[PDB]
Amino acid sequence: IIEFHVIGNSLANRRVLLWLVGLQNVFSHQLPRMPKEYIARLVFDPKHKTLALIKDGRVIGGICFRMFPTQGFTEIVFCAVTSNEQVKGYGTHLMNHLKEYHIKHNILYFLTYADEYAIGYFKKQGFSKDIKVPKSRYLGYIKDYEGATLMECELNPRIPYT
Amino acid sequence: IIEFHVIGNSLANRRVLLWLVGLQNVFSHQLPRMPKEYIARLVFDPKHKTLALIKDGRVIGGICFRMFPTQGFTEIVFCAVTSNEQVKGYGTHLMNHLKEYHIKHNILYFLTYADEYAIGYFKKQGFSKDIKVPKSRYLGYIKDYEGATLMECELNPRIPYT
Amino acid sequence: IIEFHVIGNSLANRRVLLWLVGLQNVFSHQLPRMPKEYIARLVFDPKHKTLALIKDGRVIGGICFRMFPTQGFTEIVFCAVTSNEQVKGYGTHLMNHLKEYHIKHNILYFLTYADEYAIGYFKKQGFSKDIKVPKSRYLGYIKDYEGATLMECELNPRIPYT
Amino acid sequence: IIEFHVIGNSLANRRVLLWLVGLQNVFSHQLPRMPKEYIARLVFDPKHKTLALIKDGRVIGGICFRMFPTQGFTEIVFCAVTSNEQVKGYGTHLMNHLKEYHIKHNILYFLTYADEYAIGYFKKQGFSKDIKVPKSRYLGYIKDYEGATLMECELNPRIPYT
Amino acid sequence: IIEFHVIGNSLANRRVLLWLVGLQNVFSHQLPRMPKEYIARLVFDPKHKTLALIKDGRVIGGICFRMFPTQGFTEIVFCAVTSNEQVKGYGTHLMNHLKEYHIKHNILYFLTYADEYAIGYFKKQGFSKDIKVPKSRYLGYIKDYEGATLMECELNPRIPYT
Amino acid sequence: IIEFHVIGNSLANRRVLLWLVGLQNVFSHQLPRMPKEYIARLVFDPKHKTLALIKDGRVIGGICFRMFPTQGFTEIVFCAVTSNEQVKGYGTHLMNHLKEYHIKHNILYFLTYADEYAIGYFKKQGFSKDIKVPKSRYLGYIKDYEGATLMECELNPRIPYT
Amino acid sequence: IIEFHVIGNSLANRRVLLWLVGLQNVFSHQLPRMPKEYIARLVFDPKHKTLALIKDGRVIGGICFRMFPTQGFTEIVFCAVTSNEQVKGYGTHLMNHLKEYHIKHNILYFLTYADEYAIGYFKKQGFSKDIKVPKSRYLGYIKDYEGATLMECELNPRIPYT
Amino acid sequence: IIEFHVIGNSLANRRVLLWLVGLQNVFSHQLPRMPKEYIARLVFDPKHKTLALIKDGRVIGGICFRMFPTQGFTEIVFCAVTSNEQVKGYGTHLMNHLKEYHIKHNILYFLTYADEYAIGYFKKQGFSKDIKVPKSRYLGYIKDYEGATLMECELNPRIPYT
């Protein structure tokens, strides 16, 4: 019933392609201040990936992220769970799966910009406002959001998350 | 800078992909009573095409259609122009380009179902409630919408439309 | 553990082969007035497919059908669930999965010939004795059964069935 | 030694060639009011086939027919058994083999035009003057013979014929 | 018209496929205490062959067997003739054709496990309860049937059986 | 999420590799009187296979076995379930899956040597101290353990095990 | 009449080659203190690109830039519009197009050295003397100009520039 | 009798594969607080290498390390010598060989995290708690261990170590 797939636009077949459109749709509905062409541009950007959450063949949530292996971290671009399936643990399950996928790729730091509506969920996911990654390593790589709060999560590679 | 392109999923691909994502977004917003997943599935269906209206590199309108050359007609699936570009003649220019395209393919009949709000636009584009195409030729081919009005446009192949 | 597989003799696989034999066995036991070699011929006909119901690796039911995309409908040939798995919702889930599969293929009409003993099951699956598909479109394509009654089900492509 | 072969010109070829010459000769002699050139043109037509009755390596009878699978029927073009082999059941065995062949191809309707002398043979083979196939389905496909009688045979796919 | 074909699932053919299904049907009807899926698995096992008895194109009997050339014997798995063709010498002709086939392959011993109901048929086909093949050569190769009795037939390679 | 995979070194490979490393670790911990190097050499031996019990992507149990198809039996080399997953039926489900796998390969005899602590588990899985396979067939093929008890399981190919 | 092309010397055909010579000519005339062999070396350097401004097929302006994706910024090398076409908005249109091209490549920082004659135009283009890119990230990558003023423009990827 | 091989999982043959399993075994026994799946994941990670110490064909020690040539250093992941072969100089010989291998690859800095039980051996190997590699160069690349002590060894490329 529940699935997890790290998908993305390569160079993709139709089932993954419609999953990406669903992801772009959910991100738009759940993040109205983000321009939909901006969401669509990043979701289909080849350097971006999306951990998709599938229920009975249908997208119900996902995390869009940008891996920076040469810089040693991943940027969290979009997080969303559809309106009626929220407050059920799916958001935590998504982040946990993202953490397990990243320790398997030996990337141990997440960076993200959270506004006031979002900061609480990231704190529950283990993110902090104390940033260990040096500014010279993320500035110009992650996209800055003025007025938002930069937040960082450090992963433990000896711990299982799923 | 105004452009018209007949595009669609098959089997510039990345720019066609984002165009198809932009068309699915414009269609979904302008046709809110249509399911978004239904729109996406048809927009990316291999047997469906979309005439995209591109302005300065961005999607601002389109007509999704499904050609039935073995039956002698084309089904008009979705028509939409983004709100800020409406009442400028783009919907008329879109339909005229679609007519010229189908005359080149010896397809001279458009079929569609218009609800109470859209009937007036199709009337202004030459559509009629009198259907010359026999029911045995379109039933089970076009998608029926109960309580909507079946409309037909017959194209003149000797007339220029653009 | 229950799965749904649209299988059929191509040109195949041993796991698919033994499922087809199991389907031929179940159909024949549940339809004793059908000739076994007639069931075998259709189940193994390359133009026929069967949606197999697999519980714990073994066949327990299925629906054999013939798609007529150029005609706009699909003919339902055999429906059966093994006797010890009947009256559990398996026949209904089979029909619903078949409806979803045909929506993705833009075939929106089912036609079938029901016994006096099976006509009740088809009425519950939404079938009606009112046939919208013209006779000139199904006669000579679906297999006629003198004495039985033609039944038709129209599918809504904007609705999810599974 | 009795043999039945479905043969025909395309795109043992030399023995099939002489069989086709023998069939054209038998057809011409048994159907004297048919033009010989007309018989030869259809016997060697790529879209036409002939079920040849071979006895000890020699043609003694045949049924030339044209399959219309897109229309759901087959046109019976010529039927003949050489004089010395008539009234032995070969004409009945020929038609029965043709029926079994068409059931394997999901073609369950024969159409033909019988003059006053041939109607009786087709009646004994199950043909009828009542035509279930709609006129819109056969007009302009089968060759019409004015003042002859259109006859139809419906085949039962559950019955063995050989 | 009666023929003998040593067939079996290779790696096949549709005519061979439907014969195998017919054999699976006949074996199962004539051996009701055998699980159908067990019969199906062995009939379609690539190490198993079946000598099919074909009367007028359709299966009416057969013998399924497993050759063990490195062990020096063949195991007889299933023997059946359809009920309306029994008591006609068909089962005896099947056994004789099987014996001839194995002489050409230099396998001179048959082993089998006979019911109290079938043991009489095997005695008539020359089988004996005296087993010359050592236990160390058949145990773990032939399928044991607790309660049944092992029976053995030795073939003379200088004798014609058909 | 429970999975069963038959894996093994030869000639997903990296995930099979880590599975084989996980199996060697589980085997070594659960069988401390076995040399770790001996376990690793057999787990990675080309002629040895392992049925791996995967739970949520991680090895939690397995049966290492060596098939002797030319001799008619399989040697059970190592059986283990990790401590935290014991007494849940996994050892029984592992053996049942191994039995179903071997019936598909016409191997109907398991052989193993059980010490005083493991005899009871094999008894509950149908093994017996009475050995039907002749000594001439297994001596020098299975690895002997002096002062351990040779045990044999005979599988019924007509019974379902999963 | 007006065009925009991001061109450059690869490893270029003749129309682009003459565009590059025109660009080198305009940069020389508009930047007399820059050695012409230095301008020519950079314009034809493969790691450099030039956004060319074409009027009726003729180069009238351009920006030569060096992308440093691994460093997260682009260096602005040469900017010029021909003498008679200046003070018409072309310089702003060029920079805006450069910004749109760079947000599409996820590079969000421009760096440049402006002398006293040039600082005012860059201030109107959104450049600032407050430099957010760390010195350790641009020193040795961009070419230093003593006495000139380092200037930086940060791009917003959610804003359209053309 | 004594050997040294820099081995690792590529994309490895069986002798190297069993050496890697032995290395994973020794690291587990000698570092019990390190999860064995974590040790196995890193030892078989393609970006990791292990300098293996072989005595008479058997693994008796090794250093697992991660080269970061783009960062200018190597991370020391696991060091171990089997229990009975310790305090014999093998640990120093291993590190010396690692140093010689790294000056040949022009990497002149080692970084590692040592707990209280390990700090003394690294001090004897020339490691120091004064860290010359800037934090911006190793943070997020080497795996941090809270409570452990970061330690650094600088190599001299003009000195022979073996």
Ligand SMILES: C[C@@H](O)C(=O)SCCNC(=O)CCNC(=O)[C@H](O)C(C)(C)COP(=O)(O)OP(=O)(O)OC[C@H]1O[C@@H](n2cnc3c(N)ncnc32)[C@H](O)[C@@H]1OP(=O)(O)O
């Ligand atoms: C800014 C941008 O550029 C980025 O970087 S990405 C954009 C991020 N923008 C959004 O995503 C907005 C739309 N939102 C959603 O789509 C979903 O809302 C979530 C956020 C995906 C949660 O997914 P979800 O609802 O499945 O979460 P789940 O069920 O795991 O529970 C969550 C546990 O966090 C607690 N909590 C505290 N504060 C919040 C909060 N603000 N939102 C949600 N939960 C919160 C809650 O109270 C429970 O904690 P508990 O009840 O256990 O104490």
Ligand SMILES: C[C@@H](O)C(=O)SCCNC(=O)CCNC(=O)[C@H](O)C(C)(C)COP(=O)(O)OP(=O)(O)OC[C@H]1O[C@@H](n2cnc3c(N)ncnc32)[C@H](O)[C@@H]1OP(=O)(O)O
């Ligand atoms: C399957 C089936 O469901 C479909 O296929 S979904 C198609 C229906 N999709 C929508 O409903 C989406 C929301 N809508 C729009 O996206 C745009 O509205 C349009 C419809 C694309 C017009 O495009 P547009 O605004 O560019 O039109 P354009 O400027 O060419 O002028 C058009 C001339 O028709 C006059 N007119 C009269 N009645 C209507 C009417 N109901 N709607 C629009 N115009 C109308 C108008 O007043 C002017 O009249 P004129 O000035 O010529 O006398």
Ligand SMILES: C[C@@H](O)C(=O)SCCNC(=O)CCNC(=O)[C@H](O)C(C)(C)COP(=O)(O)OP(=O)(O)OC[C@H]1O[C@@H](n2cnc3c(N)ncnc32)[C@H](O)[C@@H]1OP(=O)(O)O
């Ligand atoms: C057209 C022709 O060539 C074919 O293709 S052969 C089709 C007919 N194939 C057979 O004859 C084979 C033998 N049979 C079976 O293999 C099974 O019988 C089912 C039905 C095929 C499997 O379905 P199943 O047993 O899993 O049923 P499921 O539980 O899903 O639905 C149960 C709900 O159907 C209601 N109902 C009403 N009338 C009937 C009826 N006549 N038979 C069964 N249920 C009926 C019942 O009153 C309940 O209604 P509810 O409980 O909802 O109130």
Ligand SMILES: C[C@@H](O)C(=O)SCCNC(=O)CCNC(=O)[C@H](O)C(C)(C)COP(=O)(O)OP(=O)(O)OC[C@H]1O[C@@H](n2cnc3c(N)ncnc32)[C@H](O)[C@@H]1OP(=O)(O)O
């Ligand atoms: C496009 C359209 O123009 C055509 O497609 S051209 C087809 C017409 N081509 C000819 O006309 C050629 C000359 N003819 C022949 O080549 C042979 O004559 C036949 C027609 C091939 C019979 O073959 P055949 O002689 O082997 O027949 P067979 O032995 O199977 O028996 C048949 C049973 O039908 C009885 N019967 C009743 N009325 C007739 C009749 N008019 N003709 C033949 N039999 C007839 C017969 O008395 C026996 O009756 P039963 O004994 O069963 O009661």
Ligand SMILES: C[C@@H](O)C(=O)SCCNC(=O)CCNC(=O)[C@H](O)C(C)(C)COP(=O)(O)OP(=O)(O)OC[C@H]1O[C@@H](n2cnc3c(N)ncnc32)[C@H](O)[C@@H]1OP(=O)(O)O
């Ligand atoms: C080992 C096991 O895993 C297997 O592989 S399953 C083998 C057993 N499969 C069945 O049970 C299926 C159901 N059965 C059949 O499908 C058919 O029954 C036959 C026999 C398989 C076909 O053979 P058939 O019927 O064509 O017989 P045919 O006419 O050739 O020989 C007839 C001569 O057998 C004499 N006779 C003595 N005892 C028996 C006996 N028990 N049954 C039949 N005949 C017997 C009879 O008295 C006459 O003797 P005669 O007339 O010579 O004096």
Ligand SMILES: C[C@@H](O)C(=O)SCCNC(=O)CCNC(=O)[C@H](O)C(C)(C)COP(=O)(O)OP(=O)(O)OC[C@H]1O[C@@H](n2cnc3c(N)ncnc32)[C@H](O)[C@@H]1OP(=O)(O)O
């Ligand atoms: C070459 C030769 O050396 C080998 O091949 S090495 C194989 C021996 N490898 C070990 O020794 C490793 C340590 N052990 C384990 O890794 C697990 O222990 C098991 C053995 C994998 C059971 O797996 P498991 O714990 O999942 O078993 P599962 O839950 O299926 O139940 C099993 C039912 O057998 C009952 N039972 C009675 N006696 C024993 C016994 N001695 N051991 C286990 N169960 C036993 C139990 O009480 C329950 O009885 P029930 O509840 O059915 O009445």
Ligand SMILES: C[C@@H](O)C(=O)SCCNC(=O)CCNC(=O)[C@H](O)C(C)(C)COP(=O)(O)OP(=O)(O)OC[C@H]1O[C@@H](n2cnc3c(N)ncnc32)[C@H](O)[C@@H]1OP(=O)(O)O
């Ligand atoms: C240093 C080097 O290593 C680099 O890094 S690259 C080398 C840069 N060296 C040159 O390029 C010298 C030659 N120059 C030209 O080739 C053209 O002159 C431009 C600069 C390409 C403008 O192109 P253009 O003339 O098309 O500009 P446009 O029409 O967009 O107007 C421009 C708006 O900036 C206002 N403005 C303020 N100060 C200046 C200024 N110094 N120059 C031009 N405009 C200026 C103006 O007053 C209007 O502002 P407004 O009037 O609206 O307030």
Ligand SMILES: C[C@@H](O)C(=O)SCCNC(=O)CCNC(=O)[C@H](O)C(C)(C)COP(=O)(O)OP(=O)(O)OC[C@H]1O[C@@H](n2cnc3c(N)ncnc32)[C@H](O)[C@@H]1OP(=O)(O)O
């Ligand atoms: C933390 C982790 O994430 C890492 O980063 S890796 C994990 C490191 N964790 C271990 O490896 C624990 C298990 N351990 C071993 O597997 C072996 O124990 C060694 C460490 C490989 C030595 O190998 P080895 O025994 O062959 O050493 P060798 O014979 O060269 O002598 C060594 C010379 O260091 C002196 N010494 C002082 N303190 C220590 C100490 N703590 N351990 C060993 N020697 C020490 C000793 O007294 C003699 O010095 P001397 O006697 O000459 O003054």
